[PDB]
Amino acid sequence: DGVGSSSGNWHCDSQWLGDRVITTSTRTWALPTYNNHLYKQISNSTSGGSSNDNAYFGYSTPWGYFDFNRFHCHFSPRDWQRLINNNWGFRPKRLNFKLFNIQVKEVTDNNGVKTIANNLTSTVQVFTDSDYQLPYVLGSAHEGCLPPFPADVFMIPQYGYLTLNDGSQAVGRSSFYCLEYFPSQMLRTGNNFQFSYEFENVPFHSSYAHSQSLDRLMNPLIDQYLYYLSKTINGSGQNQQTLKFSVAGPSNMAVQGRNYIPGPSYRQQRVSTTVTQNNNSEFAWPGASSWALNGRNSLMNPGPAMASHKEGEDRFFPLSGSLIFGKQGTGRDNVDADKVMITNEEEIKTTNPVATESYGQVATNHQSAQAQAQTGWVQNQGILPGMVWQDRDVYLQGPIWAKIPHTDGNFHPSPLMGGFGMKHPPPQILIKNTPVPADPPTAFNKDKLNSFITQYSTGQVSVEIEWELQKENSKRWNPEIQYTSNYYKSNNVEFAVNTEGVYSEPRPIGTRYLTRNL
Amino acid sequence: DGVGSSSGNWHCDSQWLGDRVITTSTRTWALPTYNNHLYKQISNSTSGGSSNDNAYFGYSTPWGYFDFNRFHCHFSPRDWQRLINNNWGFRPKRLNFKLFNIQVKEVTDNNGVKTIANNLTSTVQVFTDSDYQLPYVLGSAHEGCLPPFPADVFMIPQYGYLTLNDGSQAVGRSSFYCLEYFPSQMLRTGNNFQFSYEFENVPFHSSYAHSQSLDRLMNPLIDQYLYYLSKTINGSGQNQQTLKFSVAGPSNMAVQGRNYIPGPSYRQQRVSTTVTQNNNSEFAWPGASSWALNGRNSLMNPGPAMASHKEGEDRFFPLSGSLIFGKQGTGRDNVDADKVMITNEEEIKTTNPVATESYGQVATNHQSAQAQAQTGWVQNQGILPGMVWQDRDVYLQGPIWAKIPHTDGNFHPSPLMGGFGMKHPPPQILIKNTPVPADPPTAFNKDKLNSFITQYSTGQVSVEIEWELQKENSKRWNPEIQYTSNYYKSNNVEFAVNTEGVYSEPRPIGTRYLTRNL
Amino acid sequence: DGVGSSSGNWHCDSQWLGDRVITTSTRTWALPTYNNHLYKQISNSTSGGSSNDNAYFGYSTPWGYFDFNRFHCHFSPRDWQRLINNNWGFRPKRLNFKLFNIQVKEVTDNNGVKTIANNLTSTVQVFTDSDYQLPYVLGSAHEGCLPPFPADVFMIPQYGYLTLNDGSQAVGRSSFYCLEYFPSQMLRTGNNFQFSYEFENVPFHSSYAHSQSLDRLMNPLIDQYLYYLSKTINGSGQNQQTLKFSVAGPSNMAVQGRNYIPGPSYRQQRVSTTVTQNNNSEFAWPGASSWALNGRNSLMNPGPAMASHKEGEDRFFPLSGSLIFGKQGTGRDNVDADKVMITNEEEIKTTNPVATESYGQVATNHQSAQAQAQTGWVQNQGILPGMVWQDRDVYLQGPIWAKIPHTDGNFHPSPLMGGFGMKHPPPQILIKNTPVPADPPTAFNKDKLNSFITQYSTGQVSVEIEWELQKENSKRWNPEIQYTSNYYKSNNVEFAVNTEGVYSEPRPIGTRYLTRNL
Amino acid sequence: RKNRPPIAIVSPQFQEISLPTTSTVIDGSQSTDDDKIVQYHWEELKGPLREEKISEDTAILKLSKLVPGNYTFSLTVVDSDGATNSTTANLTVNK
Amino acid sequence: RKNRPPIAIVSPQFQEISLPTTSTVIDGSQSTDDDKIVQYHWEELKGPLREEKISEDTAILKLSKLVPGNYTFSLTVVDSDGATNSTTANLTVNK
Secondary structure (H helix, E strand, O other), X not given: OOOOOOOOOOOOOEEEOOOEEEEEEEEEEEEOOOOOOOOEEEEOOOOOOEOOOOOOEEEEEEEEEEOOOEHHHOOOHHHHHHHHHHEEEEEEEEEEEEEEEEEEEEEEOOOOOOEEEEOOOOOEEEEEEOOOOOOOOOOOOXXXXXXXXXXXXXXXXXXXXXXXXXXXXXXXXXXXXXXXXXXXXXXXXXXXEEEEEEOOXXXXXXXXXXXXXXXXXXXXXXXXOOEEEEEOOXXXXXXXXXXXXXXXXXXHOOOOOOOOXXXXXXXXXXXXXXXXXXXXXXXXXOOOOEEEEOOEEEEOOOOOOOEOOOOOOOOEEEOOOOOEEEOXXXXXOOOOHHHEEEOOOHHHOOOOOEOOOOOEEEEOOOOOOOOXXXXXXXXXXXXXXXXXXXXXXXXXXXXXXXXXXXXXXXXXXXXXXXXXXXXXXXXXXXXXXOOOEOOOOOOOOOOOOOOEOOEEEEEEEEEEEEXXXXXXXXXXXXXXXXXXXXXXXXXXXXXXXXXOOOEOOOOOOOOOOOEOOO | OOOOOOOOOOOOOEEEOOOEEEEEEEEEEEEOOOOOOOOEEEEOOOOOOOOOOOOOEEEEEEEEEEOOOEHHHOOOHHHHHHHHHHEEEEEEEEEEEEEEEEEEEEEEOOOOOOEEEEOOOOOEEEEEEOOOOOOOOOOOOOOOOOOOOOOOOEEOOEEEEEOOOEOOEOOOOOOOOOHHHOOOEEEOOOOOEEEEEEOOOOOOOOOOEOOOOOOOOOOOOOOOOOEEEEEOOOOOOOOOOOOEEEEOOHHHOOOOOEOOEEOOEEOOOEEEXXXXXOOOOOOOOOOOXXXXXXXXXXXXXXXXXXXXXXXXXXXXXEOOOOOEEXXXXXXXXXXXXXXXXXXXXXXXXXXXXXXXXXXXXXXXOOOOOOOOOOEEEEOEEOEOOOEEEOOOOOOOXXXXXXXXXXXXXXXXXXXXXXXXXXXXXXXXXXXXXOOOEOOOOOOOOOOOOOOEOOEEEEEEEEEEEEEEEEEOOOOOOOOOOOOOOOOXXXXXXXXXXXXXXXXXXXXXXXXXXXXXXX | OOOOOOOOOOOOOEEEOOOEXXXXXXXXXXXXXXXXXXXXXXXXXXXXXXXXXXXXXXXXXXXXXXXOOEHHHOOOHHHHHXXXXXXEEEXXXXXXXXXXXXXXXXXXXXXXXXXXEEOOXXXXXXXXXXXXXXXXXXXOOOOOOOOOOOOOOEEOOEEEEEOOOEOOEXXXXXXXXXXXXXXXXXXXXXXXXXXXXXXXXXXXXXXXEOOOOOOOOXXXXXXXXXXXXXXXXXXXXXXXXXXXXXXXXXXXXOOOOOOOEEOOEXXXXXEEOOHHHOOOOOOOOOOOOEEEEOOEEEEOOEOOOOEOOOXXXXXXXXXXXXXXXXXXOOOOOOEOHHHEEEOOOHHHOOOOXXXXXXXXXXXXXXXXXXXOOOEEEEOEEOEOOOEEOOOOOOOXXXXXEEEOOOOOEEOOOOOOOOOEEEOOOOOEEEEEEOOOEOOOXXXXXXXXXXXXXXXXXXXXXXXXEEEEEEEOOOOOOOOOOOOOOOOOOOOOOOOOEOOOOOEOOOOOOOOOOOEOOO | OOOOOOEOOOOOOEEEEOOOOOOOEEEOOOOEXXXXXXXXXXXXXXXXXXXXXXXXXXXXXXXXXXXXXXXXXXXXXXXXXXXXXXXXXXXXXXX | OOOOOOXXXXXXXXXXXXXXXXXXXXXOXXXXXXXXXXXXXXXXXXXXXXXXXXXXXXXXXXXXXOOOEEEEEEEEEEEOOOOEEEEEEEEEEOO
16 A cells, blocks of 8 residues: 555466356556647548548547457467367456556656656556446457567557547537546555456357358258259250259259258458469459448448358458458558468358358349349348358457447347457546646646646556356267467477567467367 | 555546536646745735726735636536536535645756656645635636646646735735634645535526516506506697596507516626727727726626627627636737627526616606606616516636625625625635745854745645536426537537647536526 | 206305405306417517517417406405505415306307307316416406406406517527416316415515604604704805804704615606696607616506605606506596596605605715815615615505516515515416317318317306404504595495496505504 | 518607707607517608708607707608608797 | 648559450549548540540549540549649550
8 A cells, every 4th residue: 555565466377167267467558648638639630631431530538548358468379279179169257457556657858868767646547437438449459458478568558539520520419528527546656446347148159160061951861851943944945844843852952942041241352362363453442342331431341250262262361351460570551461360261151151252143033935034143141031140250369349339229249350249348447647747837827737747657457357168068079170289390489489589479360160060 | 644645536527416416526736836935915016006996905925725616617518518408597505625646846956957856745735714714815706716627737826815005005904814824734745635615505596598578577468457648648739738548458568567677787888899880989998887996996897787788789798797708828918809708698688677778767857838758867777676687697617606795784695797695605725835945054043044945736636516406397388498519510529629639618608598487 | 066066156255353354255257269279379460560669479378367366356345444444464375266167158150140058068177377387477467357346247368478579570489388288177067176375475565654754753852963064154255165063953854864765766757637737748658767678668657666746746646657547437548537547656655755756866076166066866766775665555456466577586576566476476277168179070181170169168266365464553542544435425336336237446445544653 | 571561650740849948759669560670760851950960760759959940850660671661750849 | 721632542543454354443532631522523634535435423433345545534632622633543455
């Protein structure tokens, strides 16, 4: 409770129990002073000018925030291997967030050399938005999460939010939120902040693959008692028209009746990682699958969970239908294809349509003696009764949850980027260095004080999520596919630091390894 | 209770209950050292010389003070909208003032570069004048209140007070108050100050408009049983004089008898915001309505609550009869008419006379066969029995209360600037950095120490007022007028920060929106 | 509870008790169908066009109402004599309103001869506005009250109300009230309506005259110990100036000091009932005392309670400062002076100023050796400390109460027309014949039914008010002035029916007969 | 909307007064309109040459320092929608 | 208020295509503005005589039934406040 007594210990364990795992995780943060304690409106006009699609209007608060909404903030690579090689599913039950060992530093650059001193009497104020009265910028797949590796320090992101706009201009119903209008908690160097949160009843993540296709769900030895129209002409003549029905069975498995159909589709453009197999034109934006909202288009990216490619063509990926991660030390502007990690979603090709292929055929006319049986293509298909699909995979680097937008309705609110869609996700934890004025004038001045002491804050942060698990019980005989670290000599151990001490995640690890038949 | 443990959290909420609202409000302050710890007499002689009207004599203490006597120190614009769109009245019940997270800084400018250090063993002393033994400078509509926006820091005003004078000179009964003669509270960096206060039984503010005029209070279908002298001559001849009485009814609503009459008036000069409609002369001071006290004139500003203008002429405002506020970033010397906000008081035109028009006519002679019926104008009218008036509106930027001066009598002590007039208003909270001498000489010197350590203080301040509310219950059918934020695209959200982070209140918001018939 | 059993008896007594009188009063009413069951907006545009002063905008409801707001609805002339000859004051305590013996009649004029039948299954709906959510048209001194004489039947007035306007047009805050939006009570021919009401704590009416003037309140034998400036020059020369003070006593009663001063004044024009003593011009409206509200002037009529005339001049009456009643069978347009009853308010000349005379003198300059002592006239005088006045008399035909308009303030809210000013006066009792459609078409028609059965309603109404009394206890020796019926042969007994059976009230009877010294 | 033009009503159509009492009054505030009158305009026609003319805009006309002669005034009222109505008022002052 | 004029950004400055694939695309939806663009206008300059001209208003330009030749298109964007910015786009189609 004092300056010279630590306000919390470093817990970073991960204890596996009978039916749950409690992944604790601690990090060191550094919170700068954002906006110089100011609230500023931000727009594409401020940012120099953007197109109609990228037009926006919002505010940038002087508040930081904590975002542990990536799977590696909690799971080590070995923990992820234990989770995905052994369980058919998992879901978070509760979290316990602690913010301790706070220490606010004051820096002075009066002589040209900065001198970071210690400000014991200065506070940092942190509050959690547990009523969801603020814009929820988590679940947008942003940066600034707790780093994957426990050893490195991270800088807390700035909290800004967007609102309604007509171009760069604010329509009358665009809200402005002051985050000082919330009851915060003012913490000195001897105080600490902690809160607990109980996750929703979200379904288990389908942490498995399917060992049975949706169209091959049947006995390959017995034939159906149903008939299908086999022939429509009994010959090659002119006026030879018949209706010959044959029983649909193992000989012709394609035509036989089925109770369920693959999930919904929304076609993407098939771009190949072998650049000589693509078109010579710039089809990046023009050839993309977008959805329009109030006039301005926006990329699907990634859209409904569809299989990335057919079997045998690993090169093809949907133009925007897959999550792309960056390798360690990868720039943020036009990097080569070998510097990113494009996640394949082929484990769900058993139930979901291929992202780069049309959902199927459909008859588009009434054939008669004069008009041939004309049939069209179904590029996008919404939900139909009897459709079964499977959601997008969660990855070690991918998001964990997202907030279901408060609307009068939704369908299957699992996030299109993967994860658990919650009406009430973990609350936004917002932290800000309390302003300290430098020297008020000796004579009263009505204007707000603009000269503050330049200072920052640092400390530790501990989040502990308890995940429920769905153990495997399958009568499969042969071994399953499991995630292994390949035993072959290499310069660096993967998922470990190299000679410079920079920790790199070398691939995106999914969850769908164990197989479960339909 | 220590240096490294915060002495209070940041509470800035505003919780609306069934019949009251509890508006909490926290700010960060910076208290400089005033007068160099000295008490000094101040006069127009000190200030270079002022006229007879502006002559004064007083003392400027080294004490700061806290002044949350503006409505935006507590109500956010949305809270104000909730209050005024839904309630017929409100009044404060109790407040809870807290002063915490104190931290006294010591600045050294020995080398030409200032170095603000931390003085842990130095104190700040704060006391509340809860017996009203000091001059009450609150309610004078001064600056230095808690800022409207929670994020910005503010500098505590200096506490000075005026007393009796004959010019710049002190008459024998002009008091001098030493504020060190009060039991204060000496707070280090680990101490805090809090006090509670119970407001008086002040009446609810008439947070409504009248949907019925004072002269149109009657049945427009039935005629009165009273007669009025209609005609005095039955023709156009010479000796044709009669007394013809006709029943006063809906046909002639002006002349019929009424039980109540509009409130008192004190005429102002009608100055138009269209400067081409004013006189070409300087009528600002010469044409003004003043009141004389001990010889020296003083502007009314704003005087009795009167309607600003007749219906249809929004441009005209009384020369001094309305509260004028300044927009953000407005100077304090001869700013244009488009840089100030002149508050209209037309919601009370139903009961109150127009500020720029005479109260009415009055007969000023005995008419006979020789003298015509001569009648005069009533420029100012004091109180009469049966008069009903309505007080001045309170605004989001306007004062909240004022202290009724201790006199043998008063009439209707509601402040002429709007608000709640209290015999015992919230006490003056006076704060001062305790002097710290620099280096006394090694040899005794009888003179008072003049070399002090240059140091200032900063910290947080929290005031929480509980307001009672008067809910609306009207059988009005059609919708009422309500305060709305206009939905039309604009560069900045109103009542919010712009790209520079400076928060601006774009208009004065009154309270009289809901309608209540007489 | 049935059609053939009366729902209430005829109580019309008036029982005098030890300290109160309980004046019961029953009448027969006839309620027509108003507006043909329609709500219509009414304006001066509808009424053909009116001036700016007489401009109005409102609605005329199909609702009747009960208005027992005249003193003769309860007091017989003998009861009034008992009240005013024996009591120093009175005030209403509680009322008990009953509405019984309802019988709805249906009239058919199909053949050119009307045939009023009996509609047993049709209802009349009556509700009392006991929360004061409607415009209060009572207390406007309208017609349609219960008749003075118990024997005659009266027709219930239509209920209409005025609202805000800019000319004939409705501003946005002008309310429209649907009276079907109130929970009414639907009464058949066997039902009845009754409610009770407890009057406010209103002060007793000063049912007395003053036997002592305000300026003659002193011992006429002893002289004051105070001095007054008697002489300012000791001679007739040039430079002869002195200050000679003489003791003010019985010799000069005008100049001696007094603690209290006459009540407020607002001068009226003195018009004489001897038309040859008036001006030859039309000074009726131009010479009148008005008050302006939102631009449009309105007559005072009657304004603050002031004495009508000085002693000895009974002919003069203020142009609008007295209540004028109409004799029996008097038209409503320009009737002769001998067909109206102008009520003298001279009983209050002891405390109140004369309505036709200025309040007094006032010094309007600083006299010096060069400027003479110049003094002006005070035509209108508002309230001052120490002012004592007396309210306007209530008359047998005059109003009883009025509703104090809901405002943030008022002064001495006694109605200027006489009576008791109440925040919560007796509620408006609103009655309407429920519409009965004639014949809906056999095929559906979305339009509202416009063909109703032409029908009216009739029945009895009983109101019983309990008045508290203030008995006289005076040590006056000689007899007081008392109201007597003059014993001299006349064609008709006054306050009684003549040969045609029409009951006439021959004079306005005040209350101020007994004398009470100041 | 389809407003009727105003009506100007001067209360004293023939105002009579002698030389001793020059201050007289002509009342035009009784002029009616379907909505409201935005301007009352007084202008003289037969007024003999005097110290000053009259163009007052008060609804009720106040006159002063009259000289003997015959006066004729025309009151112009203005509807909210621009419609006007001018009626004349006469005043004869004696020697 | 003191709006900066828009900027028209055509993604393919030199569009190249052969005769078999005439249907090409020129992207102008990347054109930026301080507020928003209310109109994208496509007009051709060097277009050889063909079945039809082009004056489309879509942000992204879709072309069809091209004939061999050299094409030059100019994209005109319009700010909300009327400011315009025209940039050119080239397309060469082979034999």
